[PDB]
């Protein structure tokens, strides 16, 4: 029922082979516990408005999910905090 | 509180006749589910004093509807008091 | 150096601290209105700021300074006279940016007088 | 939580005890128990070296895994139990293929939770993994100081250090006292704070209850005789009549820093407290 849009920024120095290893796995938790990810888009290396952990650029990925459990998005934020590749994330309930 | 789909089954359960939503058997039953939902919410968020105030208004509304039902006919009061678990 | 040495000016209701540093934040020289012998109520004056700026400006020319960025920090009366005291010495002022810190709240301002 | 006894007796007025509600089995295991014969301050010669130590209730030692090294094999928490030899509780864990051993009980480790040692482990309460793989900002207990020795730092009820940053082969760690220090990266920790967080709030009440943990009375030095203590003697009660309060053996006791200089740990303590 509830629809979430998740946008996260990956650091701009990540190895290209590791980028698909991280994006795959992190859209992986977003499809667990009744989650049925609809969109998974890439926005490319854009310029950040301000430095984030001494970074001036970064990869933007936007994933829209839908699930009436909300634990998929909480599991994302728990692991996104731990991961050093993701430097900023935001989960919006879209209605 | 309770979802709209959740409310409807309570309506269907205690409706007197079809297309009845305002009888003092469905209103009482709907409030009982609503009251228990806020009570469960306040087990965790104990100091939600603003939400607790709305719970006391729901309790008063059900209490006045139960007084009205008893004063009208005692049979329907007895059936409603046992099905819902209200003391 | 050759050029590109920023000048920070601190104009307050007291003396105006003028300091000339390189582009990477390394102080070359400095001269406040209080270092020129100025007494109070002389320290925060446009005349004092005039000598305050150029006194540090001459010390800059010895390192060969031909470019200054004026970073003014403070609401003081001796601001404009300070900047015209740099061009009068020939320092080729490029930019005039105000850097007076603005808190996004997050601190209790000291009590005002009575 | 803390239970406050009602003042039924004077010797029991302000007494308080632990409710022992987090404990789930009230009996030990015959195979992870070894004997502990109380020594009471006495040494290899037989002379009292440390004082205020003596008779107390018997106690069996419960072998703990301070060096959490079963890497890869998962383990289930079977029962959180009471330990007499420490402030925190212990938890029996059964490994996924038969062996069972005790550990220290973290704060909210529940019965039936899963815990993993190793290096590929997650960051959850109870799992042990080396300090090169523990994120900056995590609360860690049972921190080793030496690779393979066993947790030593932070092991008493409510002990938690924070991994604060890196250097090269050392990670920066703010130990409970307030000291920031460095510990080699190849050393293990355990995610979480140690339980019995209310152990420090208990009141003993009875003289005898303090004289059940193996404590013996401690006599204030200001009443021994001049031949027994520096503060002793005087006709009547006396103030400390010396420039500084002193210790039984003649060494200043209110301020003198007694840490041996020229130690091989000095290059590793950043800032200190206590």
């Amino acid at each position: 029922m509830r629809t979430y849009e998740v946008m996260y920024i990956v650091r701009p120095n990540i190895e290209e082979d590791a980028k698909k290893a991280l994006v795959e796995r992190f859209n992986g938790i977003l499809a667990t516990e009744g989650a049925e990810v609809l969109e998974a888009k890439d926005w490319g290396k854009r310029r950040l408005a301000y430095e984030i952990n001494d970074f001036k650029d970064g990869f933007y990925n936007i994933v829209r999910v839908k699930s009436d459990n909300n634990k998929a998005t909480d599991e994302f934020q728990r692991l996104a905090k731990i991961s050093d590749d993701i430097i900023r994330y935001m989960v919006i309930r879209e209605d | 509180a309770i979802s709209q789909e959740r409310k409807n089954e309570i309506i269907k359960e205690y409706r007197v006749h079809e297309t009845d939503t305002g009888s003092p058997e469905v209103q009482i039953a709907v409030l009982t589910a609503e009251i228990n939902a806020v009570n469960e919410h306040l087990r965790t968020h104990k100091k939600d004093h603003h939400s607790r105030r709305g719970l006391l208004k729901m309790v008063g509304r059900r209490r006045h509807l139960l007084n009205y039902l008893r004063s009208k006919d005692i049979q329907r009061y007895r059936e409603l008091i046992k099905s819902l678990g209200i003391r | 150096n050759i050029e590109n040495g920023v000048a920070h000016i601190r104009s307050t209701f007291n003396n105006t601290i003028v300091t000339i540093t390189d582009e990477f934040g390394n102080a070359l020289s400095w001269s406040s209105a209080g270092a020129l012998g100025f007494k109070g109520s002389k320290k925060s004056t446009p005349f004092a700021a005039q000598m305050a700026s150029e006194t540090a400006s001459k010390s800059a020319m010895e390192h060969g300074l031909k470019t200054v960025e004026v970073t003014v920090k403070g609401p003081g009366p001796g601001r404009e006279s300070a900047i015209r005291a740099l061009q009068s010495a020939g320092l080729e002022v490029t930019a005039i940016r105000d850097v007076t810190p603005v808190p996004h709240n997050g601190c209790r301002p000291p009590k005002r007088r009575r | 939580a803390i239970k406050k006894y009602k003042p039924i007796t004077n010797g029991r007025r302000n007494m308080t005890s632990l409710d022992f509600a987090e404990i789930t089995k009230t009996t030990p295991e015959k195979s992870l128990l070894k004997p502990l014969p109380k020594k009471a301050g006495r040494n290899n010669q037989g002379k009292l070296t440390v004082r205020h130590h003596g008779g107390g209730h018997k106690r069996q030692y419960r072998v703990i895994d301070f060096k959490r090294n079963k890497d890869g094999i998962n383990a289930k928490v079977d029962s959180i139990q009471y330990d007499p030899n420490r402030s925190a509780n212990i938890a029996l864990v059964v490994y996924a293929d038969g062996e069972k051993r005790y550990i220290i009980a973290p704060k909210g480790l529940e019965v039936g939770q899963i815990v993993e040692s190793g290096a590929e482990a997650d960051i959850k309460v109870g799992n042990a993994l080396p300090l090169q793989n523990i994120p900056v900002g995590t609360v860690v207990h049972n921190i080793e100081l030496k690779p393979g020795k066993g947790g030593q730092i932070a092991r008493s009820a409510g002990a938690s250090a924070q991994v604060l940053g890196k250097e090269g082969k050392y990670v920066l760690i703010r130990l409970r006292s307030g000291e920031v220090r460095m510990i080699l990266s190849t050393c293990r920790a355990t995610i979480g704070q140690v339980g019995n967080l209310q152990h420090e709030l208990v009141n003993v009440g009875k003289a005898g209850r303090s004289r059940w943990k193996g404590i013996r009375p401690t006599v204030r030095g200001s009443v021994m005789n001049p031949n027994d203590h520096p503060h002793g003697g005087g006709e009547g009660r006396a103030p400390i009549g010396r420039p500084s309060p002193m210790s039984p053996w003649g060494k200043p006791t209110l301020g003198k820093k007694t840490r041996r200089g020229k130690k091989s740990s000095d290059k590793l303590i950043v800032r200190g407290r206590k």
């Binding site: 946008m7 920024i9 950040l48 408005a49 301000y50 984030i52 970064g58 900023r88 919006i92 | - | - | -």
Partner: protein, 64 residues
């Protein structure tokens, strides 16, 4: 003057639409008062929310 949110029919201001938002942030990223921009009270609120969401996601500067 005209709102641009009622005139053009926008009923959902998106925080991903940075280009639309940059018309209301002035020279610092400072949110422009609705008297200056002429948006109604209803849309000044959802525009402020979108701007603040963009700032957090580094799609718009806090200061400039």
């Amino acid at each position: 003057k005209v709102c641009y949110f009622t005139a053009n029919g926008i009923t959902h201001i998106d925080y991903k639409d940075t280009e639309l938002l940059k018309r209301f942030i002035s020279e610092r990223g400072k949110i422009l008062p609705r008297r200056v921009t002429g948006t109604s009270a209803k849309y000044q609120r959802m525009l402020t929310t979108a701007i603040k969401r963009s700032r957090h996601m580094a799609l718009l500067p806090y200061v400039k």
